[PDB]
Design a binder for this molecule. Sequence first.
Ligand code: MG
Ligand code: MG
Ligand code: MG
Ligand code: MG
Ligand code: MG
Ligand code: MG
Ligand code: MG
Ligand code: MG
Ligand code: MG
Ligand code: MG
Ligand code: MG
Ligand code: MG
Ligand code: MG
Ligand code: MG
Ligand code: MG
Ligand code: MG
Ligand code: MG
Ligand code: MG
Ligand code: MG
Ligand code: MG
Ligand code: MG
Ligand code: MG
Ligand code: MG
Ligand code: MG
Ligand code: MG
Ligand code: MG
Ligand code: MG
Ligand code: MG
Ligand code: MG
Ligand code: MG
Ligand code: MG
Ligand code: MG
Ligand code: MG
Ligand code: MG
Ligand code: MG
Ligand code: MG
Ligand code: MG
Ligand code: MG
Lengths: 125, 155, 260
Amino acid sequence: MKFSRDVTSSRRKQRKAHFGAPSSVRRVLMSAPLSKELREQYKIRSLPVRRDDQITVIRGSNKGREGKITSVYRKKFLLLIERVTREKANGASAPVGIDASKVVITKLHLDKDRKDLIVRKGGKV
Amino acid sequence: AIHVKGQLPNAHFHKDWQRYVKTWFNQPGRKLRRRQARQTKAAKIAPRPVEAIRPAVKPPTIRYNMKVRAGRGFTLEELKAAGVSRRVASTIGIPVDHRRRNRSEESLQRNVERIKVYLAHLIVFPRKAGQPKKGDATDVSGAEQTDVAAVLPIT
Amino acid sequence: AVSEKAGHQTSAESWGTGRALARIPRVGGGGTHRSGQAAFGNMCRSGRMFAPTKTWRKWHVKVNQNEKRYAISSAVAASGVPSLLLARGHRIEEIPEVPLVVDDAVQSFQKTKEAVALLKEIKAYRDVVKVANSRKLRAGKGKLRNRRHVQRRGPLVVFNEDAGIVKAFRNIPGVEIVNVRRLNLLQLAPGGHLGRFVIWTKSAFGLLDSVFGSTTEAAQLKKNYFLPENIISNADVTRLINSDEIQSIVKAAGPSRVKR
RNA sequence: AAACUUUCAGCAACGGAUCUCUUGGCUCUCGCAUCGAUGAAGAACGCAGCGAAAUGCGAUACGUAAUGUGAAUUGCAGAAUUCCGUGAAUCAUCGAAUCUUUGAACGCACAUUGCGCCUUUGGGUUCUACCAAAGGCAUGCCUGUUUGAGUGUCAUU
RNA sequence: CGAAACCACAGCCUGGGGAACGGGCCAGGCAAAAUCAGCGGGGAAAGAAGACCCUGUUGAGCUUGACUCUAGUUUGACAUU
RNA sequence: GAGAAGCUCAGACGAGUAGGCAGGCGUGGAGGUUUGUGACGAAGCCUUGGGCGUGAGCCUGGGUCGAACAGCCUCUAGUGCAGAUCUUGGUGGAAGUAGCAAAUAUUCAAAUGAGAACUUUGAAGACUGAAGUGGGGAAAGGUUCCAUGUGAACAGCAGUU
RNA sequence: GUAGAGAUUCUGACGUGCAAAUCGAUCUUCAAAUUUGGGUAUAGGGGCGAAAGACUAAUCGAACCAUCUAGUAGCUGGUUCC
RNA sequence: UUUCAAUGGCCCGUCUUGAAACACGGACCAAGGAGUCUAGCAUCUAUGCGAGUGUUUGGGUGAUGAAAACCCAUCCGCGAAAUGAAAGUGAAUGCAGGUGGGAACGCCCUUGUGGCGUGCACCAUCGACCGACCCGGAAUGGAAGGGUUUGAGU
RNA sequence: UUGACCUCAAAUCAGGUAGGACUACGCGCUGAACUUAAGCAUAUCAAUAAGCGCAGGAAAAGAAAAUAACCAUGAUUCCCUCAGUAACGGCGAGUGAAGCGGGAAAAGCUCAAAUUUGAAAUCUGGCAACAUUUCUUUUGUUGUCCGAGUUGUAAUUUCAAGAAGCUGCUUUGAGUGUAGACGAUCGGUCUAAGUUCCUUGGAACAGGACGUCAGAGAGGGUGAGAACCCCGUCUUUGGUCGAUUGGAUAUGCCAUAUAAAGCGCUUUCGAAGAGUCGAGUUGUUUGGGAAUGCAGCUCUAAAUGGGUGGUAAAUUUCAUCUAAAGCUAAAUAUUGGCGAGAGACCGAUAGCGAACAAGUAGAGUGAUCGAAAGAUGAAAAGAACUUUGAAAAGAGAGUUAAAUAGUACGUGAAAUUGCUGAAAGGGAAGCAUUGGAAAUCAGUCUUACCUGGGUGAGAUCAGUAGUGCGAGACUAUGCAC
Ligand SMILES: [Mg+2]
Ligand SMILES: [Mg+2]
Ligand SMILES: [Mg+2]
Ligand SMILES: [Mg+2]
Ligand SMILES: [Mg+2]
Ligand SMILES: [Mg+2]
Ligand SMILES: [Mg+2]
Ligand SMILES: [Mg+2]
Ligand SMILES: [Mg+2]
Ligand SMILES: [Mg+2]
Ligand SMILES: [Mg+2]
Ligand SMILES: [Mg+2]
Ligand SMILES: [Mg+2]
Ligand SMILES: [Mg+2]
Ligand SMILES: [Mg+2]
Ligand SMILES: [Mg+2]
Ligand SMILES: [Mg+2]
Ligand SMILES: [Mg+2]
Ligand SMILES: [Mg+2]
Ligand SMILES: [Mg+2]
Ligand SMILES: [Mg+2]
Ligand SMILES: [Mg+2]
Ligand SMILES: [Mg+2]
Ligand SMILES: [Mg+2]
Ligand SMILES: [Mg+2]
Ligand SMILES: [Mg+2]
Ligand SMILES: [Mg+2]
Ligand SMILES: [Mg+2]
Ligand SMILES: [Mg+2]
Ligand SMILES: [Mg+2]
Ligand SMILES: [Mg+2]
Ligand SMILES: [Mg+2]
Ligand SMILES: [Mg+2]
Ligand SMILES: [Mg+2]
Ligand SMILES: [Mg+2]
Ligand SMILES: [Mg+2]
Ligand SMILES: [Mg+2]
Ligand SMILES: [Mg+2]
């Protein structure tokens, strides 16, 4: 149960705020759990995904596949993973989008800001 | 047309009354607002009482002159007889009513007694902290916001 | 209520008779589908509804204070009757006693785990499991209006002092917690049905006489309130009908069924 | 006997009911007080690599400065002179700026991109014509300034 | 290539009765697919909530020595004085 | 025992407009309840199958379909249609019918083209006949002007224009 | 008598039209109280009228637009399950 | 279920004395489509309390989470008194009366639709009491005595 | 002649200021008719719609020329009550307040009338310096000079008083940084837990098994109903900034603080708003009745005067207030704007006109008028390629869980239509009753239970023994074989 007068449980408002979220807000909405080894190492449960992150797919027809994140299509709340594609009619391979909540990160694209995000989030390096 | 039993009808609804219908859907909201304002005011003026002391007066007319109720403020004669200057009265929460007068000794004595009881229970803080002056108190440590009706009820 | 201007915001007038058209008002002008179409009427598309709803409909209903207190007294009395608890759907087959009263240490519980373990010890947790299994998506358009899930009611926990008991119990499905001084008919007779399963703390249970009083002694917490008297002193009428004092003066029983 | 007509069913049409949905409406409550001659509200015309309507913006034109975030945008691209970085983004936020023609609208007009005046600075031979740029020129009223008017009232020559 | 009006359902006559002139009711005459061009007897054919008439405690335009008022106009008083 | 709101025995009676009352049927939403139904197919819809009720209605087989929905006790209402020259939308018979007949008028060959009564070129026959079917403007329109392409829609037949 | 301006008769065509006033023939006037563009003035109990209650944007014995207004109706129509 | 045969069956809705009407509406189908809500009043019913009754004008637990529930003071409304235009005055002779019918109960018969005694409710009726009014009636007061009357009274 | 003063001008003079918009709520002006009265004119609708002026976060009102008639009350506003009452009304239809009482909130004051007269003690502007800041954007201080001002700017007073004198009394406003906290907030996070197994499925977020957290089982997202996948939800501190004498020993200290208020006896006093009050009259308005308020015009005051005291007048008393000048928070309003949380509301002919590029397209000279229109799929995977065709397309194929989802896309009703099948048909058809014919549907019977018969094997059954006293049921150790 919520108690704050500043929190809305309106289905209409929550759906409007989710599908109308701006680009920077959608980054936090597209978060993935860290792997078990990574959770212990960095003391962090989950992070916003990023291009050049290493994931494995945990749900769906592509469950068990691995690869880099080639792009984060935030307009569609979708991740594009390397070598996760399907065949078009004409033989061209079309990438298949996967929700960020349906992957787990196995290796982080660590960099200065990401390192700062781990310490800020209470984690360790 | 009129053919049923009962009173001849009287309903005053020939103007555009639906334009000026007043509903009370905000009644609990107003009640909460007013309580919050009282709580905000009490914390702001503390430790002064939230309500000022009022005189006891007899209501006019034969329908209510057997009763006693709070009045607006103490008369100039009542303040004089209780040894309180009218300019000082307001500074310590004693309202002054320049309009009301004392036509009888009973009204005067009753309200002079209310002022004397108020003054005896009153703790006046010195204008400069830690330098008590005349008319002030030297035991201000136990000062708290208390109801005047708890000390001086209308009897 | 609908908006007071709904269906009124047009210039339409009746075109009168002689045009081989119904006499309903119609939009003037031209160049758009709306032009010439009927307007305002409760039978017209984009007209005004019949008798538009108003905000000053009576929404709230007054009940006499004494009847309200009668209702709560009946609801509390029903909570002491194991048959009514079972009839109202509460899984109370294994609880040790009705009324069910637990120690005042429950008022100081800090965690949901302790509250859960207490419910299991007094065999009240089967009622909670009933609530969890019953949870479903609501049928109909209520699910579009912030009323998505429905479920059964669990035990009502009544305390005297809140030293953490409210926070320890509130996340458990179907459980409600209430101070003994503010008993609510909406909780004691949910849906209007008597027999809510209630768990009392010792201090709350020991305050009921000061809350409700008796038929001859005024309630301490309800000025001038006395419990109602019943119109029948002994409600076991089957016993009375078959009692010695009655059976010894009646006529011979007569045939229950007769041959044709 | 067919064709034809009529009814029913299957299938196919025509049409868009029904059901389910819903970033919309409606209604209630709570909170707040902030437009404009320092040019508002409104209007016009423009601005993007490929953009007409909407959003945004104003020749610094889907924006500049500043702050936060921290790799996107995405329909196609393009840009890897950057991605462990004062740096992507139609991102968020926002205390500095820019802010076309208008509009109360203010040099006079206006079915006219019509017709003038002033100051300074430049151009072309031009202290007076012409061209360009910058800054200016409405009305009523108030306080004050300056310059005046009166066979209004006076003092001294 | 391609409308529309109109359309309760329909469509062969005589007599009867009947809201007193029926396509349907009752009794007769009768009765055979699918169609074309014409026609103006019938469908009391269509159109338009009769425009005549009456009723309405429903209007409007117009008239007048109707009822009640009114711009204006005229005369007086007072003020301006 | 026989939902005592139950059970049992008996007699008489049955038109109905306007109107009155009672008991029921069905619809949206609310509280309660039913280890309620459901992607192993909810709701909805079709049916040349079955069952129940005097009836309002209800249950069910088969088909279609894809995400919700129902029973029981109560609460509640914007709750039930054949009509209103009713509203909005869709769609009929009339019908391949009425008709597409003012302004004299077209014809031959070639080219192009999938296709030519209607395009283009040449030839013939004609017309406006200078108060023009000619050559310009004002008002009004606003790109309709020109070239290159296209030929779904429009040009009430056609289309390569 | 032609251009122009009209509109007598056929009670012609048409009369779900080429057209919410047109088409044909016939006819009236044709150098003035003539016809007409543009500019300008007059606005609704008002205008304007060589006077027909005419004309005032297919509207006239009082235009058109919005509002009062869901105007009132002893009158007509309708008024939904067993 | 379809169809055939035999017998019967006019087109519904409406206003109407009377509709199959040569009375009006209705070509077809879907979806929409009309006794509502509010301020009162009246009867009837249910519930609570009862010479009382009505917590929601307000104030409090209250901050947590609170439009709910729950609690709490003074007023006030309606009722506990009428009558009169008003100034005013204001309800027991008596078991709070008598008479008739009468529910329920008790007692006697003697098997009848009985007699006897209390008598609820209600109705009819004779009085008493309060107010108004009309009387005489021994400056101000109207006490005892009255009245064919009068009141939405006791 | 000049100068002064007065009055009046001018300037693109130095510096300011007003207008327009928003109108839900607020203060005024102006002002209908429909309507009701079963007609209709007064009345009503209505001191309303429309028209015009003018504001704010609220406005307006407001510290009595107020009530009352009491044992009196005591600015204003709002609520409940008074009360559908007193009253008004073709006394018809209709209309209709106030004092008291309870409650919300409370707060009180400023001028003009006075000789500072041993001292215009007052103010604006320019210039200069010095400070100050939500702020180089803000706001002042001092000096100096010039203007204003004696036709009066200050100071004490405002009737509740008060002033001048007689006589006796105590003594106060500003900077620094701590802790306690508090407004914008935050590098915004310590804040918890399954994405294990089986089945179905394209997809698990479904069912089952096994676990977990819960101060978090609100809501939303994610390939189907997810507390534990994601955002959040719940709970609770530590980094700043600014209001920071607001409170504390507010310490530690600034040095405010030398002359201004309180009561106290006695005096003589005590200025108090004019074309206004009031009267008449006309119009309007009100519940206001021989005038409730407002306005025009005529007349026009007073000094214990004047107003009010709800029946006109004359007189006499009594009570109460103190007009004709001014300010003021709160409690109250709020269909506009902005931000937020909800709902027994509507669910695409509904709900705003507008769920969608809607005040849009479109109409009208103009004022104005003003729509229609939501849904492939989890994902375009939006159908390669072959073939027939001038092409549009078709047919094979292909994708998909599904093309009975192909964008003319969820479901896909009815009217209406084509094909196929069935059947019937001499100037309608439809319906009812009864059967024929044809078509089609259901009986699943004789299952259960009981007994007899055949063989078969088996921990073997009635009375009992023992383990709550009398009687009855049950299980359990054995015997009964
Ligand atoms: Mg509507
Ligand atoms: Mg449904
Ligand atoms: Mg006929
Ligand atoms: Mg007629
Ligand atoms: Mg009957
Ligand atoms: Mg509804
Ligand atoms: Mg199904
Ligand atoms: Mg069918
Ligand atoms: Mg049956
Ligand atoms: Mg309805
Ligand atoms: Mg229908
Ligand atoms: Mg009907
Ligand atoms: Mg119709
Ligand atoms: Mg033809
Ligand atoms: Mg010729
Ligand atoms: Mg010729
Ligand atoms: Mg030319
Ligand atoms: Mg003719
Ligand atoms: Mg109506
Ligand atoms: Mg009307
Ligand atoms: Mg027959
Ligand atoms: Mg009749
Ligand atoms: Mg009929
Ligand atoms: Mg008729
Ligand atoms: Mg008729
Ligand atoms: Mg018809
Ligand atoms: Mg319907
Ligand atoms: Mg009338
Ligand atoms: Mg009438
Ligand atoms: Mg009339
Ligand atoms: Mg107005
Ligand atoms: Mg403002
Ligand atoms: Mg104000
Ligand atoms: Mg005063
Ligand atoms: Mg009135
Ligand atoms: Mg005065
Ligand atoms: Mg007026
Ligand atoms: Mg499917």
